[PDB]
Structure formats: C-alpha cells, structure tokens
Design a protein around this ligand. Structure first.
Ligand code: CHL
Ligand code: CLA
Ligand code: CLA
Ligand code: CLA
Ligand code: CLA
Ligand SMILES: CCCCCCCCCCCCCCCC(=O)OC[C@H](COP(=O)(O)OC[C@@H](O)CO)OC(=O)CCCCCCCCCCCCCCC
Ligand SMILES: CC(/C=C/C=C(C)/C=C/[C@@]12O[C@]1(C)C[C@@H](O)CC2(C)C)=C\C=C\C=C(C)\C=C\C=C(C)\C=C\[C@@]12O[C@]1(C)C[C@@H](O)CC2(C)C
Ligand SMILES: CC(/C=C/C=C(C)/C=C/[C@@]12O[C@]1(C)C[C@@H](O)CC2(C)C)=C\C=C\C=C(C)\C=C\C=C(C)\C=C\[C@@]12O[C@]1(C)C[C@@H](O)CC2(C)C
Ligand SMILES: CC1=C(/C=C/C(C)=C/C=C/C(C)=C/C=C/C=C(C)/C=C/C=C(C)/C=C/C2=C(C)CCCC2(C)C)C(C)(C)CCC1
Ligand SMILES: CC1=C(/C=C/C(C)=C/C=C/C(C)=C/C=C/C=C(C)/C=C/C=C(C)/C=C/C2=C(C)CCCC2(C)C)C(C)(C)CCC1
Ligand SMILES: CCCCCCCCCCCCO[C@H]1O[C@H](CO)[C@@H](O[C@H]2O[C@H](CO)[C@@H](O)[C@H](O)[C@H]2O)[C@H](O)[C@H]1O
Ligand SMILES: CCCCCCCCCCCCO[C@H]1O[C@H](CO)[C@@H](O[C@H]2O[C@H](CO)[C@@H](O)[C@H](O)[C@H]2O)[C@H](O)[C@H]1O
Lengths: 194, 165, 74, 217, 80, 74, 194
C-alpha cells in the first residue's frame, strides 16, 4: 500500500494491497467489481502516460519560444503552415488527419487485441529496467505517481488558460511577479463575488 | 390569410354588420323615453352588441366575405397562427368533462353491482355514494390509464354473451 | 338557426373546410393561398406536367364559372 | 399517526406497511389516485423527480434574485432570463433544446428502465465498466453510488430523517414555483418585488387587492 | 430511333430471359369440352419452351418495345 | 385451355397473413363466391352502384358532351 | 449474442442466440414467425450490401469532385452525355435501361432460384476469408454491423438532401464550420416549431 489518502480512514477491501499506487481512494466505489477495476487499472496508466507526454510537450513548446500549447494548431484554421522546431512541415490538416487516424488505428488496434496488457515489456522495454520483477514494484509506483501528477497538471493548464487566456509558463511568471495580485482568486471567474 | 380569409378587425363586411345591428336597435329606441325601462333594456343590448364585436375582433377571428367569423379546426394551422382557442383548446375541454361524467357513472355502476339488489340502486340513487364518486372523478384521466395498463378496464371475451354465428 | 333568429349572425359556428380546401389547392386552385403541388409554380409536379395537360387543367380549375372544383365554405 | 387533516379517515391504501414506509405519508390522497399499489409506486417516483427538479429550479430563481437585489449579482427576472441569455449565446435555442432532449433523453431512459426492472442497468458489459455503479440501492428513487459522493445515505440512523427533509422541502419548492407563475400574471413583477411590496404594506398589498384573483369581490 | 432494332432488340431480350432465366420459375408457379386442355402444345425445345410461351414473352417484348419508341417520339414534338 | 395464366383459387389460397391476423385468410372463398349467385350479385350491385355515383360526380364537373354545361335543366 | 440494444432488457425468445447481429431488437415482434424471420434475415443482408455500395459510391463521387449522388443522372434528362471518372460513356438512357434490366434479371433470377442463400462462398469468395466457416462468425458480425450503418447513412443522405439540398460532403463541411448553427435543428424543416 502506497499510503492513505485520508488519515484515519479505512482502506476499501476491494482494492488489492499489491496494486501499484494504491492509497485506498475510492469514495464512490467505482472499482468495486473486479471486472470494472481491471478495465480502470489499464485506463489510468494509459491516461497517465499520455498526460506525461502531453504535459512535457506543452511545456517544451513554450520554453523553447514557439508559443503555448493552445495556439499550436491555429495555422490549420488561419491558413498558415505547420512548423516543428521552426522548420516548415509540408503536410496540411487533411493529410494529418488521415495519417494520424490510420497510424493510431493500427497501433491502438494492436493494443486492444492484447486484452489489457498494461506492462508489455519486451520491445517496449529495450533497456530492461523492468526486467526484474522485484524492482518493477517500485518503478510501477513511480510511473503511476508521476502520471497522476501529469494528469492534474494538464487539467491545470486547461482550467488556467480558460480563466486567464495565457500559457502555463506565462502564468507561472505572472504569479511569481505578484503572488498576491495574480492567482485564481483574482482572475474574476474562479471566485464569484469578487 | 388562411384559406383566403381575412381578420375580422380588418373586414369591411364585419364592420358593416355591426352598424346594421346597432342601427336596428337605434330605430326601436326612438319611440321610448330616455329613462323608461324599455330604453334602458335597449341600451343594455346595444352595449353588449358593441362589446361582442370588439371581443371577437380582439380574439383574432378570421372573417369570410360575408363578414362572419370562421373557425379553424386543423391543429397545425390553429397552433401556427394563434387560433388554438377556437376548436383545439375547446376540444380538450369537452373531452375532460365528458370523460368525467362517463367515468363517474361507470364507477357508480360497478360499485352498486356488489349490493343485494343492484337494480334498486339505479332507480333510487345512493346519493351519499354518488356524491363521493363525483368529487373523485376529477382524476379520471389518471385512473383510466391505470386500469388500461392493468388490464382491468375491459372484460374478457369468455364472459360476454353473443348470439349464434 | 337560433343565432339567426335572435338577429346575431356573427355568433354562429362556422367551421371552415380546410381539409377539403387543402385538397383543392393541391389540384391547382389558387383561391385559398395554400400554394403547394399544382398550386406551387416551383413544384416538380407543376413543372413535369406543364407541357402535357396542366395548362388546360389549370385554366379550367381556376375559372369560377364552371363546376370544376367549386369553391367551398362553411 | 400524523395526518394532513386531523380526525379525517385516512385512506386504507396509505395505511399499509408499504405505503407508510414512503417519506411524507400524511394520509393525503382524497382523489384515491394511489389506490392501485403499482400506480402508487410510479407516482412516488414522479413526486421525487418533481421535488428535486423544483428544488433546483426554485433555488435558481430565488438565490440569484436575492443576490441581485443585494447588488452582489445582476441577473434578470426568471421570466426574462431565457431571452437575455440567448442573445449572448453561441447557439440558437432550437439547437440548444435539441441537444438537451438527446442528453436528457439518454439518462431518463436509463432511469426509466431501472423503474421497470430495478437494478437492471448493472447488466455486465452494457456500459464501459461503469454499469456496476448503476444498479442503485434497494429503494427505488434513491440511486446512491456515484449520485451520493459524500456517502450521507450510508448512515442508517439518519436515513429516515434525510428522506423526510427532501420530500418536505421538495413539496414546498413545487408550491413556490406555482406561486411564481401565478404572481407573474397577477402582478407583473418579480418574486422578490412581490415580497418587498407585501412587507411594505401587508394589509393593502396582497392577492385580495391585486384585481385578478378575486373578481367577485 | 429505328423501329426494327428497338422492337427486335426488346423482343430478343424478353425471349432470352423467358427461356434462360425465368422459365424455371414460371413452370414452378404454373404447376364441358371447352374447358379442357385437349390440345397439348408439345415442343421439341430442350427446355420445354413452346409456342404459347413464345407468344407471351414475345408479346411483352413488343409492348415494351413500342413504349420506348412512343416515349422517345415525344421529344422534339410541337404543340404537345 | 393454353397452360398459362393464373388460377383464381390458387391466388386466394395464397393470401393468408403469416401472423394469423386474418385467421385462415381467403381459404375456401373461391367456392363460396363461385357457388353463390347472391354473393356474385351483391358484388356486382355494389360495384355498379358505386360506379353510377362516380358517373354522376364526374359528368357534372367534367362535362363530356358539347353544350351540356349551359343546358342547366339537363 | 452481439449485445443488448436496451440494457437491462430480455432478448425475445424467437431470436436465436447464434443469429449474426442479434442484439435482441424486435420491439414490434416482426420476426415472431420462424418463416418470416428466415426471409427477413436474408433481406437484411441484401439491403446492407447494396447500401454499403451505395454509400461508398455516393461518397466517392463527391470526394473525387464529380458532383454529388443526387446530380449524377441529370445528364440523362438535360440532353447531356454520361461520364465516369471524366471518361465519356457512349451509351444513352434507353440503352442503359436495356442493359441493366437484362443483366439484373439474369443475376437476380439466378439468386432467387438458389432458395434464400445469403453466404454463397465459392466463386463469390475467391480469397477464402470465410472458407473455414469457424471464424466466419466474427466476419459475419462485421458485415451486418457495417451494413446496418450503411443503411442508416444512406437514409441520412436522402433525408439531409431533402432538407438542405446539399451533398453529404458539402453538408459535413457546413456542420464543421458552424456546428451549433448548422444542423437538423436549424433547417427550418425537420422541427417545424424551432
Ligand atoms: C396536502 C396539503 C394539505 C392541505 C390541503 C391541508 C388542509 C387543511 N389542513 Mg392540514 N392540510 C395539508 C397538509 C397538512 N396539514 C397538516 C396539519 C394540520 C393540522 C394540525 C390541522 C390541519 C388543518 C387543515 C385544514 C384547515 C382549514 C382552514 O380553513 O384553515 C385556514 C387556514 C389558515 C388559517 C392558515 C392560513 C395561512 C396563511 C396562508 C399564511 C399567513 C402567514 C403570514 C406570515 C401571517 C402574517 C403575520 C401575522 C402575525 C398577522 C385544511 C382542510 C386543521 C383542521 O381543521 O384540521 C381538522 C388542523 O387543525 N392540517 C400537516 C402536518 C402533518 C400537513 C402536512 O403536509
Ligand atoms: C503527446 C505527444 C505530443 C504531441 C501530440 C505533440 C504535438 C505537437 N507538437 Mg509537441 N512535443 C512533445 C510531445 C507532443 N507534441 C514532446 C514530448 C516534446 C519535447 C521533446 C515536444 C516538443 C515540441 C516542439 C519543440 C514543437 C512541438 C510542436 C508540436 C506540433 C507539431 C508536431 C509535428 O509537426 O510533429 C512532426 C514531427 C515529426 C514527425 C518528427 C518526430 C517523429 C519521431 C522521430 C518518431 C515518433 C514515433 C503539435 C501540436 C511544434 C509546435 O507546436 O510549433 C508551433 C513545435 O515547435 N512539440
Ligand atoms: C384529420 C386529418 C388531417 C388532415 C387532412 C390534415 C391536413 C393538414 N395538416 Mg394537420 N393535423 C391533424 C389532422 C389532419 N391534418 C392532426 C390530428 C394533428 C395533430 C396530431 C395535426 C397536426 C398538424 C401539424 C403539426 C401540421 C399540420 C399541417 C397540415 C397541413 C399540411 C401538412 C399535410 O400535408 O397534412 C396532411 C395530413 C396528413 C398526411 C395526416 C398527418 C398529418 C401530420 C399529423 C402533420 C404533418 C405536418 C407536415 C409534416 C408539415 C410540413 C411543413 C409545413 C410548413 C407544410 C394540411 C392542411 C401542417 C400545416 O400546414 O401547419 C400549418 C402542420 O405543420 N397538421
Ligand atoms: C433547474 C436548474 C436550472 C436551470 C434550468 C437554470 C437555467 C438558467 N440559469 Mg440558473 N441557476 C440554478 C439552476 C438552474 N438554472 C441554480 C441552482 C443556481 C445557483 C443558485 C443558478 C444560478 C444562476 C446564475 C447566477 C445565472 C443563471 C443563469 C441561467 C441561464 C443560463 C444558463 C447557462 O448559460 O448555463 C451554462 C452553464 C453550464 C453549461 C454548466 C454549469 C457552469 C457553471 C459555471 C459550473 C458551476 C460548478 C459548481 C460551482 C461546482 C438559464 C436560464 C444565468 C442567466 O440568467 O443569465 C441571463 C445566470 O446569470 N443561473
Ligand atoms: C433465346 C432462346 C430460345 C428461344 C426463344 C427459343 C425458341 C424456340 N425453340 Mg429453342 N433452343 C434454344 C433456345 C431458344 N429457343 C437453344 C439454346 C437450343 C439448343 C441449341 C434450342 C433448341 C431447340 C430445338 C431443337 C427446337 C427448338 C424449338 C423452339 C421453338 C418451339 C416452339 C414450338 O413449336 O412450340 C410448340 C421456339 C421458337 C423447336 C422448334 O420447332 O423450333 C422451330 C425445336 O425443334 N429449340
Ligand atoms: C415504431 C417506430 C416507427 C416505425 C414503425 C413501422 C411499423 C410498420 C408496421 C408494422 C405493424 C405490424 O406489426 O403489422 C402486423 C400486420 C401484418 O401481418 P402479417 O401476418 O402479414 O405480418 C407479420 C409480420 O410482422 C411478419 O411476417 O399488419 C398490421 O397489423 C397492420 C399493417 C399496416 C399496413 C399499412 C399499409 C396499409 C394500406 C391500406 C390501404 C390504404 C389506402 C389509402 C391510403 C393510400
Ligand atoms: C484529470 C484527469 C482525471 C481525473 C480523475 C479523477 C480526479 C477521478 C477521481 C475519482 O475517480 C476516482 C479515482 C475514484 C472514485 O471513487 C472517485 C472519483 C473522485 C470520481 C485526467 C487527465 C488526463 C489528461 C490527459 C490524458 C492529457 C493528454 C494530453 C495530451 C496528449 C496533449 C497533447 C497536446 O498538448 C500537446 C502536447 C501540444 C498541443 O499543442 C496539442 C495537444 C494535442 C493539446
Ligand atoms: C418541476 C417544477 C418546476 C421546475 C422549474 C424549473 C426547472 C425552472 C427553471 C428555470 O427557472 C430557472 C431556474 C431560471 C429561469 O430563468 C428559466 C427556467 C427554465 C424557467 C415544478 C413542479 C410543480 C408541481 C406542482 C405545483 C404540483 C402540485 C400537485 C398537487 C397540489 C397535487 C395534489 C393532489 O395529487 C395529490 C397529492 C393527491 C390527490 O389525491 C389530490 C390532488 C389535489 C390531485
Ligand atoms: C428455332 C430456334 C431458334 C430461333 C428462334 C427464333 C428466331 C425465334 C423468334 C421468335 C419471334 C420473332 C417471336 C415473336 C413474337 C411476337 C409476338 C407474340 C408479338 C406480339 C405483339 C403484340 C401483342 C402487340 C400488341 C400491340 C399492338 C397490336 C398495337 C400497339 C400496342 C401493342 C404493342 C401492345 C434459336 C436459334 C434461338 C435456337 C434454335 C432453335
Ligand atoms: C354484406 C355482404 C356483402 C355486401 C357487401 C357490400 C354491399 C359492400 C360494399 C362495399 C363498398 C361500396 C365499398 C367501397 C369501397 C371503396 C374503396 C375502398 C375506395 C378506394 C379508393 C381509393 C384507394 C382511391 C385512391 C385515389 C384517390 C382518392 C385520389 C387519387 C387517385 C387514387 C386512385 C390514388 C357481400 C355481397 C360481399 C356478401 C357478404 C355479405
Ligand atoms: C429500383 C429497385 C427495383 C427493384 C425491382 C425488383 C423486382 C423484383 C421482381 C421479382 C419477380 C419474381 O422473381 C423472383 O421470384 C421468386 C422469388 O419471389 C424466385 O424464385 C424462387 O422463389 C421462391 C420463393 O422465395 C423459392 O422458394 C424458390 O426457390 C423459387 O421459386 C425467382 O427466381 C425470382 O426471379
Ligand atoms: C465512410 C465515411 C467517410 C467520410 C469521409 C469524410 C471526408 C471529409 C472531407 C472534408 C469535408 C469538408 O470539406 C468541404 O468543406 C467545404 C466547405 O465550404 C465544402 O464546400 C466542400 O464540399 C468541401 O471542401
């Protein structure tokens, strides 16, 4: 058990102790049925892995000076052209949709057939970090914890942008400049009567 | 407008009809004195006549070439052009009252068929029982559906007499 | 009859035969203003027959001096 | 035995153990609408849905109205909000309503099928693993599960009291909305405006003097 | 349209389908002295296609053929 | 006598809705109609009777004879 | 069983469990008679197969830029000339009717005598995907589901054109430009009171 989400509470019986990232958090009892929990366990890791790529990508674009995550696709609607690290990409929106749909369908179709294989290893573990079973326990916990953090972080990007309209790096700079005058309570939307 | 009709408020024949009706009353009003009872009665009729023509025009009735209001019965036309109060709304007013009467009578008939002498309760009304059923008939549309859904509204064919065929 | 007897012809119940007038309009009678099918000059039915028989039929049905789909009312 | 009319004869169909287990049973059914047990079960569901919708709707009229009077917010009258909102909206009301019917129709259908076969929406494989949370509880109209995030229903010693409070406030909210509709036509003002006008001069500003409710007087 | 090719073509088409396509279906569906089939219209055709069938399928061909000629003749007509 | 065409009895026996909504359907009606002169006369009168009304309704509205419309008495 | 069309319901007893595409959907109990169901089973596949070709043909014409499905036969009425991929076809309308009636009668007459056979295989399965007949169950489900979707799509083409008069691809572009202002609820036709 990683820990307890609510000190003084009792962990649900249906959450296995060995399950990585198990803090006994299921107030709605969504994972009570074993079949439902099996699907949700895979879905959480898949969400976390995408969020980690999504958050890392969102920060890299703005840190390197190519804009924020929100304005990246505007070229496809304003008649512009795609760029990657500044170099033009000849493809257009229609071509991108077709290639992405085919590429993802083939890749996600293969994963779907495997039947909920969260940790395949092999070709996906070239360096063999998770080759050993004993060490894999801690690494799985680190993956799910960083993954849960990334999911929350991306929700922060989306919520913060809607309220303020700025990028995640710009928001961090604004908060650091005037911490007490730039926060969620002063954006005029998060807290109503102000 | 609908079916070549015109609004009564814009109809020359409709306006002319009101003048003729008032003119007929005015002619009779000449032979009576100002304060006499016949004069008061005639003027009261004149006020009602003017109100009538004012109200029908206000309600938006369509008038024919004759200048008389014509009703619209198709629900689509009535609801599209604001004539629902002519036939459509009155339709459901009647069916509520008519079903009320029918449902209350049916309840009384069924109630007294469990008595020792059912036919005596049909010529000498059980007024206390009849009165109770009358008040409870306001919810007949709900009660009738439940019997229809429960299969108790209708009798089974095996219990109904028929002639040889 | 009672409304007529009491001298109030405006209080009588006169229900327009809209269902029948609608059928007459469908046949090309332009009096009622429904304007669809043979009463609508932009309908396919009006256009397709415009070289065979509609000219003669439409001339006859929109003449109120014959018996071809007489005008109807309450 | 609490009754809506002390000394009246409580209907027999409301004195059964099943009927007395319903929340808010005060023996009130003069029309005998709930005499059939199957119908009473359906009408109990209808009352809960009307109660909960009326409570949300009346709170969405009264709280913004009271804050608007206090100046905290600036919300139009409940009977004018639809027009004001649509002018500044991203969609016409027709497309907005159509989407609403699709979304409401889907959840209402799932609730409908649960009334007919309680617990049937937990059919394995029907929903993407979430069907386990759609079985509801042993009582029809109290789904619990994801619908009760704080788990207040799990407290057995407080369960009967929670249900009575819901139906009591729900019945009050329904009459409040009917009051809003009637008062809009009678006075042509907002609900809080009506309250202020009554408090200013209670003995001369009420329904007996609005010129509509009592025409004979 | 030339009448000979249209009428001959339609007749040929309807005789072919009646002999190679629908002959079997027709036979299955098909299966005081003035009411008896006294004369059996025997034929030497391998498939049983006899004169009565030729008249039937041939008649449909002629009827359909003239319909094509009649409909086409309207195009380009005057006062009609 | 030529081995082609329909047998009327065959047609009637075939038209029985599968769900049993019409029971046995039209089974036995060939003999019923064919053996009853009154069934035949009833059908003939009903058909001719309706056709006579159609003649009345169409001849006044679509007069086929020259100068018929103006002869009001006729 | 493919699934349940109405979660929590019971499948009608007259729909066998092994019937491809069996979601238990028969609220009007049209297939209650076993003989009627046998005809319906064959007819559904035939309708689906034609609809799959029809929808593909309707979409292919407009995507490639040769008008929409509705305007395809206008040449035969305006005195034009038939074209296919921009290649003129010498035949005229009367000739086309002759070829189609003769060809379809021959092919459809042959199929009719077969006695309600829906999966011929053999010459109609040159690559032998369903030759095994063991895994054919999955393929038959895919055929019926794609066929049902194609049937629904084609009715969408006809209905949408009758309401807006635009081609399916043009209508899709109209929806994407203004999703909330361009849909069935804004035609002025589908819902009279909107
Ligand atoms: C379903 C709804 C319902 C209905 C229609 C009734 C109807 C009735 N109840 Mg019943 N009750 C109902 C629910 C309930 N009742 C009760 C408990 C009781 C009791 C205890 C009694 C009744 C009684 C009565 C009758 C009163 C007759 C009358 O003219 O009163 C006239 C009405 C009034 C005087 C009230 C008017 C209030 C006014 C509209 C509001 C004014 C508020 C302002 C702030 C005042 C201004 C300030 C002041 C200082 C000037 C009446 C038939 C009485 C009776 O006769 O029983 C035999 C009775 O004793 N009911 C409960 C609790 C269990 C109910 C719960 O739902
Ligand atoms: C979930 C992952 C993800 C996704 C969907 C995107 C998507 C996008 N990125 Mg981002 N990015 C990501 C992760 C991601 N990024 C990460 C992890 C990094 C850090 C290395 C970056 C760093 C980055 C930069 C610096 C830029 C983008 C940009 C872009 C845009 C153009 C991408 C392109 O043309 O690629 C096409 C690229 C390739 C085909 C080459 C890589 C393919 C590898 C070798 C194989 C993959 C299998 C697009 C909105 C550009 C942008 O938004 O400009 C305005 C841009 O400048 N990304
Ligand atoms: C007793 C039979 C009857 C007849 C002959 C008619 C005839 C008519 N109705 Mg009415 N209608 C009836 C009963 C009838 N209705 C009933 C019982 C209802 C309540 C359910 C309605 C509800 C209704 C609506 C909502 C509308 C009509 C409309 C119409 C007119 C045009 C549509 C049409 O083709 O209708 C022929 C009738 C039928 C084939 C029978 C079924 C008709 C359904 C219920 C309505 C069809 C509406 C149609 C799709 C609207 C198209 C657009 C419109 C702008 C033309 C036409 C004069 C339309 C109209 O003109 O409104 C101003 C219209 O919008 N009717
Ligand atoms: C039955 C429930 C109900 C209904 C049908 C409505 C309907 C309406 N409300 Mg009301 N409202 C309700 C309950 C309801 N309200 C409640 C319970 C409250 C709290 C007391 C309010 C407070 C409220 C305010 C303050 C305002 C409205 C407004 C509106 C209008 C615009 C709605 C909109 O744009 O939503 C868009 C909303 C969504 C798509 C989803 C919800 C978004 C919020 C921000 C999330 C809140 C999350 C929560 C804090 C956790 C509309 C007439 C507005 C109006 O009248 O404008 C002219 C307006 O200003 N409502
Ligand atoms: C298009 C197909 C077709 C058509 C329309 C006909 C039509 C006919 N064939 Mg048949 N026939 C066909 C194909 C066809 N055949 C083929 C493919 C063969 C095999 C080579 C034959 C071999 C054949 C023979 C051997 C005979 C016929 C005969 C006949 C005639 C029989 C009429 C009769 O005497 O009724 C009563 C009729 C005109 C018989 C006849 O008398 O022809 C003049 C006859 O003897 N046919
Ligand atoms: C619900 C969702 C919307 C779609 C509903 C579609 C329902 C389809 C019907 C199924 C209804 C159903 O189950 O039917 C069953 C029954 C047909 O009986 P059968 O034994 O032939 O067939 C049963 C079949 O379900 C299986 O074989 O038909 C009826 O009872 C009514 C038929 C109406 C026929 C309509 C046409 C009649 C025309 C008469 C002449 C009119 C002249 C004047 C006007 C021109
Ligand atoms: C927040 C989130 C999920 C949160 C879930 C929560 C709290 C659930 C809580 C509970 O259920 C439990 C557990 C148990 C129950 O008993 C109780 C509740 C309370 C119900 C998921 C985020 C999930 C977030 C994900 C997957 C984000 C993916 C982002 C990607 C791929 C972004 C890509 C790009 O950003 C780039 C890189 C560059 C840009 O230019 C373009 C785009 C395309 C935008
Ligand atoms: C659901 C409901 C109200 C819902 C309101 C909503 C959603 C409002 C939403 C909005 O306002 C907002 C928030 C903001 C606005 O800008 C826009 C709108 C959209 C307007 C009221 C029900 C209101 C329901 C009412 C009033 C029902 C009353 C029933 C009674 C009295 C029945 C009595 C009896 O049946 C018994 C019990 C027993 C029998 O024996 C005898 C009799 C007498 C028959
Ligand atoms: C022997 C032989 C052969 C040949 C054959 C032939 C060549 C045949 C022919 C046949 C024919 C060639 C036939 C025909 C027929 C026809 C008919 C039968 C017709 C009919 C018609 C009608 C009926 C008409 C009508 C009408 C009129 C009169 C008018 C107008 C309208 C109408 C059109 C309707 C072969 C080689 C193949 C094979 C081997 C053997
Ligand atoms: C008793 C009896 C009898 C008798 C009977 C009778 C006498 C009957 C009659 C009946 C009748 C007398 C009927 C009628 C009917 C009719 C109908 C059914 C009609 C229809 C129509 C239609 C359908 C139309 C349509 C249309 C129109 C409207 C317009 C346009 C065109 C068209 C065509 C589309 C008998 C002998 C059998 C025997 C047994 C017993
Ligand atoms: C625009 C779209 C137009 C579509 C037009 C369709 C026209 C259909 C006409 C069908 C005429 C009858 O033709 C069809 O009859 C029978 C089916 O009914 C088939 O024949 C079969 O039918 C019986 C009943 O199903 C089977 O038991 C037998 O094997 C066999 O007799 C014929 O081989 C076929 O040709
Ligand atoms: C089987 C289903 C396949 C679906 C394929 C969908 C392909 C969609 C292609 C792009 C659609 C939008 O493109 C459309 O937008 C324009 C907007 O003015 C339209 O105009 C054109 O018809 C087209 O360019």
């Amino acid at each position: 058990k990683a820990g307890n989400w609510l000190p003084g509470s009792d962990a649900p019986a249906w959450l296995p102790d060995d399950l990585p990232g198990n803090y006994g958090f299921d107030p709605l009892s969504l994972g009570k049925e074993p079949a439902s929990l099996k699907r949700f366990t895979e879905s959480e890791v898949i969400h976390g892995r995408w969020a980690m790529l999504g958050v890392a990508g969102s920060l890299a674009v703005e840190l390197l000076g190519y804009g924020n995550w929100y304005d990246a696709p505007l070229w496809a609607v304003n008649g512009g052209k795609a760029t990657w690290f500044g170099i033009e990409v000849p493809f257009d929106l229609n071509a991108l949709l077709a290639f992405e749909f085919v590429a993802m369908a083939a890749a996600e179709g293969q994963r779907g057939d495997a039947g909920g294989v969260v940790y395949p290893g092999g070709a996906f573990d070239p360096l063999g970090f998770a080759k050993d079973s004993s060490k894999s326990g801690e690494l799985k916990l680190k993956e799910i914890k960083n993954g849960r953090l990334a999911m929350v972080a991306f929700l922060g990007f989306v919520a913060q942008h809607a309220a303020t309209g700025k990028g995640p790096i710009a928001a961090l700079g604004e908060h650091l400049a005037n911490p007490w005058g730039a926060n969620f309570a002063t954006n005029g939307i998060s807290v109503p009567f102000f | 407008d609908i079916a070549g009709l015109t609004p009564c408020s814009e109809s020359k024949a409709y306006a002319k009809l009101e003048k003729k009706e008032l003119k007929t009353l005015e002619k009779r009003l000449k032979q009576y004195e100002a304060d006499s009872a016949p004069a008061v009665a005639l003027k009261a009729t004149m006020e009602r006549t003017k109100a009538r023509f004012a109200n029908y025009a206000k309600a938006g009735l369509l008038c024919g070439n004759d200048g008389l209001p014509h009703l619209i019965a198709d629900p689509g036309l009535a609801l599209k052009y604001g004539h629902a109060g002519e036939v459509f709304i009155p339709t459901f007013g009647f069916l509520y009252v008519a079903g009320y009467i029918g449902y209350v009578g049916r309840q009384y008939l069924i109630a007294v068929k469990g008595e020792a002498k059912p036919t005596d309760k049909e010529i000498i009304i059980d007024v206390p029982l009849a009165t109770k059923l009358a008040w409870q008939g306001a919810g007949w549309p709900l009660a009738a559906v439940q019997e229809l859904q429960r299969g108790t509204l209708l009798e089974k064919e095996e219990n109904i007499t028929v002639s040889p065929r | 009859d009672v409304m007529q007897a009491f001298g109030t012809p405006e209080k009588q119940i006169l229900i327009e035969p809209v269902f029948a007038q609608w059928i007459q309009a469908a046949h090309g009678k332009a009096l009622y203003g429904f304007d669809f099918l043979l009463s609508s000059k932009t309908s396919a039915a009006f256009a397709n027959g415009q070289s065979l028989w509609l000219p003669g039929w439409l001339d006859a049905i929109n003449n109120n001096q014959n018996s071809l789909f007489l005008t109807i009312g309450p | 035995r609490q009754s809506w009319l002390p000394g009246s004869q409580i209907p027999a169909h409301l004195d059964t153990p099943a009927a007395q287990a319903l929340a808010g049973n005060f023996g009130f059914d003069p029309l005998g609408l709930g005499k059939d047990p199957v119908a009473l079960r359906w009408y109990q569901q209808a009352e809960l849905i009307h109660c909960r919708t009326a409570m949300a709707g009346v709170a969405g009229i009264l709280i913004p109205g009271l804050l608007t009077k206090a100046g905290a917010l600036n919300v139009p009258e409940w009977y004018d909000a639809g027009k004001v909102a649509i002018e500044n909206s991203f969609a016409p009301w027709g497309s907005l309503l159509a989407v609403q019917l699709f979304l409401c129709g889907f959840v209402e259908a799932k609730r409908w099928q649960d009334i007919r076969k309680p617990g049937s929406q937990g059919e394995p494989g029907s929903f993407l693993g979430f069907e386990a949370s759609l079985k509801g509880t042993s009582e029809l109209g109290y789904p619990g599960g994801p619908f009760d995030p704080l788990g207040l229903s799990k407290e057995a010693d407080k369960w009967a009291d929670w249900k009575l409070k819901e139906v009591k406030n729900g019945r009050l909210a329904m009459l409040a909305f009917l009051g809003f509709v009637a008062q809009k036509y009678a006075t042509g003002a907002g609900p809080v405006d009506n309250l202020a006008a009554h408090l200013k001069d209670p003995w001369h500003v009420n329904y007996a003097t609005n010129g509509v409710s009592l025409p004979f007087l | 349209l030339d009448p000979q090719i249209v009428i001959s073509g339609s007749t040929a088409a309807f005789l072919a389908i009646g002999r190679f396509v629908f002959l079997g279906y027709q036979r299955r569906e098909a299966n005081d002295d003035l009411q008896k089939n006294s004369t059996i219209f025997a034929t030497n055709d391998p498939a049983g296609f006899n004169i009565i069938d030729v008249a039937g399928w041939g008649a449909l061909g002629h009827a359909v053929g003239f319909a094509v000629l009649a409909i086409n003749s309207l195009q380009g007509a005057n006062l009609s | 006598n030529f081995g082609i065409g329909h047998r009327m009895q065959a047609i009637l026996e075939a038209h029985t809705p599968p769900s049993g909504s019409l029971g046995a359907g039209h089974k036995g009606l060939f003999d019923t109609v064919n053996n009853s002169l009154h069934f035949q006369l009833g059908l003939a009168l009903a058909s001719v009777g309706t056709i006579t009304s159609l003649v009345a309704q169409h001849m006044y509205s679509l007069p086929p004879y020259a100068f018929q419309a103006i002869d009001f008495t006729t």
